[PDB]
Amino acid sequence: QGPHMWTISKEYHIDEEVGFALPNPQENLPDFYNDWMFIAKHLPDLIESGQLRERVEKLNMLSIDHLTDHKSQRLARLVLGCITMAYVWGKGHGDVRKVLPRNIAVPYCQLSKKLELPPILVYADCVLANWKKKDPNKPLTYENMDVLFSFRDGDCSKGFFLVSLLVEIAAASAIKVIPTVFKAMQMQERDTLLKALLEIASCLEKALQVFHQIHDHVNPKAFFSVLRIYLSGWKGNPQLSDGLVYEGFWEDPKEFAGGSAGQSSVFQCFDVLLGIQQTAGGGHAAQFLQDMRRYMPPAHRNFLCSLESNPSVREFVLSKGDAGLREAYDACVKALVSLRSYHLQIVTKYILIPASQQAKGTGGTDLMNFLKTVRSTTEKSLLKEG
Ligand code: HEM
Numbered sequence: 180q181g182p183h184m185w186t187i188s189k190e191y192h193i194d195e196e197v198g199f200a201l202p203n204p205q206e207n208l209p210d211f212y213n214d215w216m217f218i219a220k221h222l223p224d225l226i227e228s229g230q231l232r233e234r235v236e237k238l239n240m241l242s243i244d245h246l247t248d249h250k251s252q253r254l255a256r257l258v259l260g261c262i263t264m265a266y267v268w269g270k271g272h273g274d275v276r277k278v279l280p281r282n283i284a285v286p287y288c289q290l291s292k293k294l295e296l297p298p299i300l301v302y303a304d305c306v307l308a309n310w311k312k313k314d315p316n317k318p319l320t321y322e323n324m325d326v327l328f329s330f331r332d333g334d335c336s337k338g339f340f341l342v343s344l345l346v347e348i349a350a351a352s353a354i355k356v357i358p359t360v361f362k363a364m365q366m367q368e369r370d371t372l373l374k375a376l377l378e379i380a381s382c383l384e385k386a387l388q389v390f391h392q393i394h395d396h397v398n399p400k401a402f403f404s405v406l407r408i409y410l411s412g413w414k415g416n417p418q419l420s421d422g423l424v425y426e427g428f429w430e431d432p433k434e435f436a437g438g439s440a441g442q443s444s445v446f447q448c449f450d451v452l453l454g455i456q457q458t459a460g461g462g463h464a465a466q467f468l469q470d471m472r473r474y475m476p477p478a479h480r481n482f483l484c485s486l487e488s489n490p491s492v493r494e495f496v497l498s499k500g501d502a503g504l505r506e507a508y509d510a511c512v513k514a515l516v517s518l519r520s521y522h523l524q525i526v527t528k529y530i531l532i533p534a535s536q537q538a539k540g541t542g543g544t545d546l547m548n549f550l551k552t553v554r555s556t557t558e559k560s561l562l563k564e565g
């Protein structure tokens with residue numbers, strides 16, 4: 180019949196409440212994995228004391244066969260991924276391990292192959308599956324939430340991961356409007372389309388207000404001098420120029436990029452929907468965002484290329500000579516420009532200024548240039564405002 184997004188199929192694994200985030204993540208693994216759980220839950224103490232690497236090297240190789248459902252496999256990825264970052268970087272002062280012991284590398288790679296995700300911590304692990312409600316009968320607010328794992332005391336990982344998650348959830352409230360958009364275009368329902376675009380804009384405007392909470396829960400000194408170390412990967416990294424050896428799984432060292440919000444499917448989703456061709460051309464920013472799709476869960480990666488197969492919303496609006504429809508489309512693009520402009524100020528506070536008192540991103544190239552290119556591509560998609 181063809182690529183028609185008239186409904187969001189349950190096979191895309193997009194939750195009605197939390198969107199691309201993992202709904203009600205599992206907190207405990209079966210008892211068989213207690214040795215992994217003790218290490219993952221005590222990374223601040225084990226790293227600070229210099230005992231982390233020895234505790235990891237003492238592990239027996241545990242089979243992944245006892246992780247029988249999706250949520251336990253996602254929790255185990257988050258546990259193994261946090262342990263791997265702590266093992267590779269240690270205290271973060273130049274003494275790096277270039278070989279991941281087989282006792283963790285083998286189950287980590289087996290589980291990563293099973294979930295079609297690389298054997299490195301991704302945004303879907305440390306943001307989308309790394310959370311819980313303190314009280315299940317209370318709403319999804321910062322006060323009623325916590326992360327499952329942190330790297331070091333005072334690293335601000337709770338604030339950084341949770342505010343990223345909250346923004347991600349706020350933007351997700353617009354996903355349910357996508358089938359209304361495609362259906363209104365197919366059925367030539369102008370008023371329905373206009374109303375749907377304004378609702379998407381409203382959601383993206385609310386996501387910016389949610390972002391303001393970053394200042395209360397993250398401090399620049401801790402983010403840049405402490406958390407930054409554990410967010411780093413091994414692709415174009417001079418500290419691990421050939422990548423990491425996953426002992427017992429692969430013969431040669433392998434390179435994988437560190438976790439990135441370029442792996443967020445909700446932001447890539449609205450750029451695709453609005454025809455902001457962030458992945459077009461052969462430039463660095465476009466190549467990076469396309470590359471980050473292979474670091475997203477497979478159903479979410481599938482949702483994005485499915486959106487790309489649908490008719491263009493931008494081309495539909497551009498061809499109508501309808502001021503009301505063009506304004507509603509621009510309200511969506513404007514809300515993304517506003518988010519990106521505010522995020523540039525956040526990056527200046529949390530990265531640029533601390534770095535100046537001491538910038539390359541996950542892609543190995545200047546992060547300010549990447550962000551400004553992404554923002555500029557969005558601003559240039561406005562049909563009028565200039
Ligand atoms: C302490 C605050 C923050 C800092 C320092 C920060 C830093 C960065 C950096 C360095 C990048 C470039 C990509 C990379 O190198 O991995 C990036 C991209 C991005 N960030 Fe953040 N970020 C912050 C907060 C947030 C929050 C709360 C969100 C909400 C989900 C967010 C969403 C994004 C998105 C979607 C991108 C991809 C580029 C774009 O779509 O404009 N960031 N961020």
Ligand SMILES: COc1cc(F)c(-n2cc([C@H](O)c3c(C4CC4)ncc4cncn34)nn2)cc1F
Pocket residue numbers: 301302305306339340343402403407410438439440441529530538539540541546
């Ligand atoms: C030179 O100094 C630095 C360079 C940097 F690249 C970073 N860095 C990288 C990320 C990453 O993209 C990220 C993540 C990941 C954990 C998955 N999660 C949420 C998020 C929101 N926006 C970005 N997010 N955030 N900061 C930090 C640095 F200090």
